[PDB]
Amino acid sequence: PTVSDLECKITECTYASDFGGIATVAYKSSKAGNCPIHSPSGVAVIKEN
């Protein structure tokens, strides 16, 4: 991993849903890796980790 230039764009969402939110995180890495996707919220969770 090396993470730089991170942005979140939400393309579409279902309002306050089970996992009805679809968003894309576009990014730059200096070294490709696998980075954990996350939200520290308890009123929101990311489906994937």
């Binding site: 764009k9 393309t11 894309t24 576009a26």
Partner: protein, 49 residues
């Protein structure tokens, strides 16, 4: 014989009035409200990039 301007023949939309339930065919009349389901396939992948 009082055909000096039947509505078919002066139809100001070029409607070919046709008979039986009655209809005005191939007009230039109005503007048409359309609720159109756009295919998601005809937008970009997930990002304007």
């Amino acid at each position: 014989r009082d055909k000096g301007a039947p509505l078919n023949d002066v139809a100001p939309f070029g409607c070919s009035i046709a008979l039986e339930p009655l209809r005005a065919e191939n007009c230039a009349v109005g503007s048409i409200p359309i609720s159109i389901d756009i295919p998601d396939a005809a937008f970009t992948r997930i990002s304007e990039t």
